[PDB]
Amino acid sequence: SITKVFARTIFDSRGNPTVEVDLYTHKGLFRAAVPSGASTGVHEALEMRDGDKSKYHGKSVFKAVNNVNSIIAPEIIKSGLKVTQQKECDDFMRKLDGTENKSRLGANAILGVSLAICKAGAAELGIPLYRHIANLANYSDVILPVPAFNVINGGSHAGNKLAMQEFMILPTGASSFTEAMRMGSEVYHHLKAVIKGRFGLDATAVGDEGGFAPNILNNKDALTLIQESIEKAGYTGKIEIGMDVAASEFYKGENIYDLDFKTANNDGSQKITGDQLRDMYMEFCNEFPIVSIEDPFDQDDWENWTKMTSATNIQIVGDDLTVTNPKRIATAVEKKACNCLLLKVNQIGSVTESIDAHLLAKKNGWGTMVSHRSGETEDCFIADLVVGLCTGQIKTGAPCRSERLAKYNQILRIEEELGSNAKFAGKKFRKPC
Amino acid sequence: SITKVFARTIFDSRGNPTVEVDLYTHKGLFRAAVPSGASTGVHEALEMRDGDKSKYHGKSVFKAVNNVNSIIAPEIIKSGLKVTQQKECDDFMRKLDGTENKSRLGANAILGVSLAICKAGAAELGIPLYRHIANLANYSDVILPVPAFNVINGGSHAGNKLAMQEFMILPTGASSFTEAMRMGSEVYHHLKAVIKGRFGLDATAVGDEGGFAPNILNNKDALTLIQESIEKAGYTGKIEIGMDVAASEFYKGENIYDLDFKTANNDGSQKITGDQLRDMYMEFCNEFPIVSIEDPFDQDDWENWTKMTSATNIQIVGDDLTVTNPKRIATAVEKKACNCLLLKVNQIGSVTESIDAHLLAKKNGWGTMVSHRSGETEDCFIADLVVGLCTGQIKTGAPCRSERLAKYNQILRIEEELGSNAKFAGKKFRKPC
Ligand SMILES: [Mg+2]
Ligand SMILES: [Mg+2]
Ligand SMILES: [Mg+2]
Ligand SMILES: [Mg+2]
C-alpha cells in the first residue's frame, strides 16, 4: 500500500518552519502538516528543532524532515503495513523511534506520517476522513461540534493587566454548526466595534489565534465585555462562555497565585490562595454564563483541582494538567481533578494515541475538547478528528486568520456532506455521544 | 466534461462570508474560493453581497452562491463546454451575466467557477496548475517569484497615523525562493523583536495581512525601522523595499493630498500638492532602497502618475488605477502612467480576463505583481498563477497568518517540483521573462 513518504518544511501561522508529509498509495497523494509543539516538556512528546540559532532563530526542522525521509519512510515502506492498519503503523513508528517521548526521531517527524497514513486509510476504504476516524474509535454515529471561539486574551500573551489567558464564546444554543458560525462571527464583529471605540483602533489587531487583547483592567471586565457583545448581537441566552486560565503561569507555590504576575516586583496585592481563586471562579460562574474553565489551577496543584471540580457543575478542562498523556490523564481521573481532556494530537504524536487518550477520557466520564496549537497550518485534520470522535467541542481559534477558518470551514463542509444525519452537539457539548 | 458545480459559503481570513466552488469532472473534484478586498477601488468588478444588515453585518453571499448553484451551474453544464476551454467557459459566463461589471451574477460567483474550471482543465491535461496557466499564456518557461512581504502598516486600516498603507520587503538578493523565505521570515522575527522593545508587546499584534502597525510617527521612520530590522537579520544589501501608498485614501480633490488625513479636524500643515508628494517619494528613494511604489497617486489623478513614471526609474505599480482591467490598463499605457500591473483576479472576475490583463501589460513593457486581497482564504491559486505567468513578483502577505503562508508554502512546493529547472527571479523581478 505505502509507495512513497516524503517530508518538506513549510511555514506555520506564526512564520516558523514546520514539517509537512506527502504520502502516496495507489489512490494518490495524502498530505498533512504538523502544528507547533513542546520540544522542551517533562511529559509532552518532543518536537525536534534544529536549534541552530543562526537559521530561522533555531526553529527550523531539517532534522525532523530528514528523519522522515531517511529513517521512517524506508522503514515503514519496507514493513509492508497498509494505511488501513493505523495502529500497526503507529506502533511500528513508536518502536522504530523507541523512546517514551518520541525524542529520537521527533514527534513532528512521526505525527506528519501518522496523520497522512490516516487520510490515506480513509481513501483506501472510500469513506470521508471523519467517518474513518469514527470507525477507529468505534463510533457508529458522528456529531458536529460546538465551536469555542477565542475572543479576548490576557495572561503572558497580552500587555494588559489580565492574568487569565483567554476568554472564549461557545454558541451552545445554535441549532446547527451553520448557525453557530453565524453566532460566533457576528459577536466577534460586534466585539471588534466595541473595542474600536473604547480602546482605539490599535486594540483591534489580533494575536496568534485571531482574537483581541485590549487594555482591559480586570478579568471580570473581560467577561462583561463579552456579555455585552452577545447582547448587542441579540444572542443572549444562546452563547455561553469558556475560559482558559493557564494558572501555572501565575502560580507562586505554597498555594499562592499572583493575579498581578505580569507586574514585576509588585506589592503582592493580588497574591491569593487557591481557595480564594476558586471563590473567584464561583463568583464569575454565578454572574456570567460560564460553562467551561480550562487550567483553573497549576499543572501540579491537584488538591485545588479536585476541590473545584467537586464544588462546581461546569466543565473543568485539563491542558497543562494532562498534556494529552494517558499517564497524567489516569492520575487526574483517579484524583477526580477535572472532567474534560484538552486534546492536542501533536502533544502525544500519533493518531492512535490521540484516539486512545480520547477513549480513556470517555471511559471515565470526561468530555474531550479538540484543540489547535498557537502555531497552526492550513491543515484541517482536527476538523475531521473532532467530528469522528464525537466529542462535541473544538477550540481552534477566533473566526479570524485562515489557520483557524480552515478548520471551521472544513466542519461546514462536513455538515453539508452529512445532510439529515448532521446532528449538532448544542447544549450537550459536554457528553454528546 | 463538467458534471457538477456547487457553491457554498465559507469564512475568509477576516471572519467574513465568501464564495467557495466545487466543480466536478470525470477526473474528480476541483475546489476554488474567492478573496475579498477590505477596501475596494471604485472601478472593480462587482462583488455581490446580500446587504441584509441583520445577517453577518450585510456581508453574507447567499445570492452569489445561489447564482452559481441555480444559474451558472445548469447553464454551463448544458453548454457542454469543457474545463479545457478556459476562454470559452469564461466568455460564456460573462455573456450569461450580460453586464460590464458582472453586477447581475456577481464577480465572486463567476470567478469561483472560473478558478475551478482552470484547476480542472489542468487535471484534464495531467499537468500542475502552474504549467496549465503557463500554457494558457503561451509561456514555455516558468520562474519563481520574489516575495513581497507586507511587514509595516499605516493607512485607513492602521491606528498609527501613517498615511501610506503598506511597507514591504523583497529579498531580491536571495539565491532561491527558499532563501527568500528564510530572509523574509528572519527579518520579520527581528522586526517583531525591535517593535516589542520599543513599542510594547501589544504593538506586536498583527493586521489583516500578518504585519505590524506600531505607533510610528512618520513614514520615514517606518522605512528606518525596516532598515534597522534588515540589519539585525544581517541581510542589508539583499533586501529591498516596496510601498503601497494607497493614495486614493488621502486625496483631497484638486492636486492636494493630506498626509494627516487620519487626524480629524487637523491643521492644513500636511496637505500638499501631487508635485510635493512626488518629491517626497524621490527623497525616500534617494535615502532608502525602495524599488517599487504602488498607487502613489489617486486612482484617477492621471497627470501625477505620468509625471512620476517619467521622472523615476523605479517600479510604479497600478492597483486601484488599473483594477486588473484591460480597458483601464489601455488608458494607463497610453498615458505611460505606470510600469507595473497589480494583478487581482477578483478585480476583473475571470481567469481569462486576468491573463489577458497581464498579457496586455507585458506587451507594453510593464511588470506584473500578482496580489492577494486583505480578505484571503486557505485557497492558494495565485501561487500557481504568479509562477505560470512568469511575473517574478508576488505580494501575498507577511510570513504570518496561514491565508498568506498557504500561498508561500505552495510556491515552496512548486520550487521542489521544478527541481534543478527552478529559477528564482531575484534582481530581475521587474522583467524576468
Ligand atoms: Mg491552554
Ligand atoms: Mg487558544
Ligand atoms: Mg484595491
Ligand atoms: Mg493597493
Q: How far is residue B401 from each of residues A16, A33, A378, A398, B211, measured CA to CA in Å?
A: 11, 15, 9, 13, 9
Q: Which three cell numbers stand for residue B363?
A: 506587451
- Contact partners, residue A183, CB within 8 Å, separation at least 6: A171, A173, A174, A233, A235, A238, A239
Number of inter-chain CB pairs under 8 A, A vs B: 136
For residue A42, what is the DSSP state? S
CA distance B90 to chain A (A): 26
User: Helix, strand, or coil here: A238?
Assistant: coil
What b/e sequence results for B172-189 when a residue is b if at least 16 CB atoms lie within 10 Å of its CB, and e otherwise? bbbeebbbbbbbbbbbbb
Question: Residue B38: CB partners within 8 Å, gap ≥ 6?
Answer: B14, B157, B208, B373, B374, B375
CA proximity to B409, closest of B132, B124, B184, B235: B184
Q: Which of B315, B286, B152 shows the shortest CA–CA distance to B219?
A: B152
Closest ligand to Cα B168: 4
Say what the alpha-carbon torsion angle A350, A351, A357, A362 is, to the nearest 10 degrees. Answer: 180
Distance (Å, whole) CA B98 – CA B62: 21
- Size of chain A in residues: 433
| Chain B environment of A10 (Cβ under 8 Å) | 405, 409, 412
Ligand nearest to the CA of A149: 2
**CA A255 / ligand 1 centre spacing (Å):** 20
Q: Report the C-alpha gap between B294 and B337 in whole angstroms.
A: 12
* CA pair distance A64, B318, nearest whole angstrom: 43
Q: What is the spatial distance between Cα A184 and Cα A191, in angstroms, rounded to a whole number?
A: 11
Is residue A354 within a helix (H) or strand (E), and if so which, with residue range?
A: helix A351-363
Which among B16, B398, B401 has the least Cβ separation from residue A401?
Answer: B401
Catalytic residue among B238, B344, B362, B395: B344
> Measured in angstroms, how far is the CA atom of residue A207 from the centroid of ligand 2?
10
Give, as one character, the DSSP assignment of residue A420: G
A212: left (phi over 0), alpha (psi -120 to 50) or beta: beta
Q: For residue B394, what are the β-bridge partners? A: B147, B370
Q: Beta partners for A257?
A: A251, A272
The type of residue at B299 is Q
Start-to-end CA distance of chain A, whole Å, equals: 33
Q: What are the residues facing B289 on neighbouring strands?
A: none
Q: CA A391, CA A404: separation in Å to the nearest integer?
A: 19
Give Cα A41 to chain centroid, integer Å.
17
CB A226 within 8 A of CB A214: no
Please list the residues that pair with B17 across neighbouring strands. Answer: B11
Q: For residue B33, what is its C-alpha cell?
A: 474560493
**Residue B431, strand partner residues:** none
**Chain B neighbors of A215, CB-CB under 8 A:** 202
> Are the C-beta atoms of residues B214 and A159 closer than 8 Å to each other?
no
Taking the CB of residue A63, how many other CB atoms lie within 10 A of it? 16
What are the start-end ranges of the H helices in A68-218?
73-79, 86-97, 107-124, 129-137, 177-199
The 3-class SS string of chain B reads CCCEEEEEEEECCCCCEEEEEEEEECCEEEEEECCECCCCCCCCCCCCCCCCCCCHHHCCCHHHHHHHHHHHHHHHHHHCCCCCCHHHHHHHHHHHHCCCCCCCCCHHHHHHHHHHHHHHHHHHCCCCHHHHHHHHCCCCCCCECEECEEEEECCCCCCCCCCCCEEEEECCCCCCHHHHHHHHHHHHHHHHHHHHHHHCCHHHCECCCCCECCCCCCHHHHHHHHHHHHHHCCCECCEEEEEECCHHHCECCCCEEECCCCCCCCCHHHEEEHHHHHHHHHHHHHHCCEEEEECCCCCCCHHHHHHHHHHCCCEEEECCCCCCCHHHHHHHHHHCCCCEEEECHHHHCCHHHHHHHHHHHHHCCCEEEEECCCECCCCCHHHHHHHHCCCCEEECCCCCCHHHHHHHHHHHHHHHHHHHHCCECHHHCCCCC
Judge whether B131 and B122 are in contact, CB under 8 Å: yes
Any idea where the domains of chain B sit in the sequence?
4-126, 146-428
Pairwise CA distance, residues B29 & B235, whole Å:
43
Nearest-angstrom CA–CA distance, B132 and A378: 24
Decide: B89 and B75 in contact? Cβ < 8 Å. Answer: no
CA distance A62 to A55: 10
Give the other-Cβ count within 10 Å of B198's Cβ. 13
Pairing of β B4-11 and β B17-25: antiparallel
Smallest CA-to-CA distance from A399 within A384, A411, A416 is with A411
Catalytic residue positions of A?
A: 209, 344
CA distance linking residue B83 with residue A76, whole number of Å: 39
Distance (Å) from CA A267 to ligand 4 centroid: 50
Q: CA A346, CA B139: separation in Å to the nearest integer? A: 43
The answer to whether B385 touches B345, Cβ cutoff 8 Å, is yes
Considering the candidates B44, B166, B186, B209, report the single residue annotated as catalytic.
Answer: B209
Other residues' Cβ atoms within 10 Å of the Cβ of residue B401: 28
| Residues whose CB is less than 8 angstroms from the CB of residue B31 and which lie 6 or more positions away in sequence, other chains included | B20, B21, B22, B23, B116, B119, B379
**Count of other CB atoms within 10 angstroms of residue A55:** 14
Dihedral sign (CA A157, A162, A166, A169): negative
- Backbone φ and ψ for A275, nearest 5 degrees, come out as -70, -35
Among 3.40.640.10, 3.30.10.20, 3.40.50.300, 3.30.390.10, name the CATH number for the domain at B4-126. Answer: 3.30.390.10
Pairing of strands A256-258, A251-253: antiparallel
| CA-based max dimension of chain B | 65
Q: Chain A closest CA to B382's CA: distance in Å?
A: 16
What cell does A57 get? 532563530
Q: Alpha-carbon distance B403 to B407, whole Å?
A: 7
For the stretch A368-396, what's the b/e string if a residue is b when 16 or more beta carbons lie within 10 angstroms of its beta carbon? bbbbbbebbbbbbbbbbbbbbbbbbbbbb
- Residues 6+ away with beta carbon under 8 Å from A99: none
Euclidean distance between CA atoms A71 and B327, whole angstroms: 57
Separation between Cα atoms, residue A260 and residue A101, nearest integer Å? 34
Which of these CATH numbers, 1.20.120.1200, 3.20.20.120, 3.40.50.150, 3.20.20.70, describes A146-428? Answer: 3.20.20.120
What is the Cα–Cα distance from B409 to A378, expressed in whole angstroms?
Answer: 10
Q: Let me know the angle formed at the C-alpha of B359 by B353 and B365, rounded to the nearest 5 degrees.
A: 140
Phi, psi of B349 (to 5 degrees): 110, 5
User: Could you give the 3-state DSSP secondary structure of residue A10?
Assistant: strand
Give CA separation, A95 vs A75, A98, A105, A306, in Å.
Answer: 11, 5, 11, 36
Distance CA A212, CA A166 (A): 10
Amino acid found at A311 = A
**Opening angle at CA B308, ends B304 and B312, nearest 5:** 180
Q: What angle do CA A33, A37, A40 make, to 5 degrees?
A: 145
Query: Where do we find the cell 491573463?
Result: B355
The DSSP code for A99 is S
3-state secondary structure of A423: coil
Residue A389 per-residue DSSP state: T
Starting from the CA of residue A372, give the closest ligand: 2
8 A C-beta contact, residue A175 and residue A426: yes
A406 vs B160, B402, B409: nearest CB: B402
> What nine digits make up the cell of B58?
450585510
Distances (CA, A) of B85 to A150, A185, B89, B223, B376: 45, 39, 6, 46, 27
How many C-beta atoms lie closer than 10 Å to residue B83's C-beta? 25
Instruction: List the grid coordinates of A33.
Output: 502538516
Helix, strand, or coil (residue A342):
strand
Cell representation of residue B173? 538578493
Q: Which residues, including other chains, have CB under 8 Å from residue B233's CB and lie 6 or more apart?
A: B183, B186, B187, B190
DSSP state of A46: P
Query: SS3 breakdown of chain A: % helix, strand, coil, rounded to 5?
Result: 45, 20, 40
What is the C-alpha separation between B63 and A160, in angstroms, rounded? Answer: 42
Q: Please give the grid coordinates belonging to residue B23.
A: 466543480
| B165 and B384 Cβ atoms separated by less than 8 Å | no
Q: Obtained via which technique?
A: X-ray
Amino acid at A53: K
CA angle A136/A139/A143 to nearest 5° reads 115
Q: Which residues of A touch B407 (CB under 8 A)?
A: none
With CB atoms and an 8 Å threshold, state whether A205 touches B201: no
For residue A354, give every residue at least 6 positions away whose Cβ sits within 8 Å of its Cβ, in sequence order, or none. A324, A343, A345, A348, A385
Interacting residues of B379 by C-beta distance below 8 A, sequence separation 6+? B31, B32, B33, B35, B115, B406
| Number of Cα atoms under 13 Å in the Cβ half of residue B66 | 7
Asked if B427 is an active-site residue, the reply is no
Q: How far is the first Cα of chain B from the last one, in angstroms, to the nearest whole number?
A: 33
Closest CA to A240 of A140, A338, A335, A169: A169
Q: Which three cell numbers stand for residue A199?
A: 480602546
CA distance B56 to chain A (A): 6
**DSSP per position, A258-312:** ETTTTSTT--STTEEEHHHHHHHHHHHHHHS-EEEEE--S-TT-HHHHHHHHHH-
β-pair partners for B343: B370
Give exposure, B319-357, as e/b (b: 16+ Cβ within 10 Å).
bbbbbbbbebbeebbeeebbbbbbbbbbbbbbbbbbbbb
A345: part of which helix (H) or strand (E)? helix A345-348
Query: Is A86 in contact with A117 (CB distance < 8 Å)?
Result: yes
Contacts 24+ apart (CB under 8 A), A326-330: A326/A353, A326/A356, A326/A357, A326/A360, A327/A43, A328/A43, A329/A357, A329/A360, A329/A361, A330/A360
CA dist A322 and B327 (Å) reads 62
Neighbours of A327 (CB within 10 A): 11
Bridge partners of residue A6, in order along the sequence:
A22
- Residue B37 · residue B156 · CB < 8 Å: no
Resolution in units of Å = 2.5
| Residue A53: burial class (beta carbons within 10 Å; 0-12, 13-18, 19+) | exposed
What length is written for chain B?
433
CA distance B251 to B248: 5
Report phi then psi at B215, rounded to 5. Answer: -90, 55
C-alpha B166/C-alpha B181 separation (Å) is 19
Q: Among B30, B61, B66, which Cα is nearest to B46's?
A: B61
Give dist(CA A209, CA B205) in Å, integer: 11
All three cell numbers of A74, joined, read: 524506508
Chain A: residue nearest B374 by CA? A401
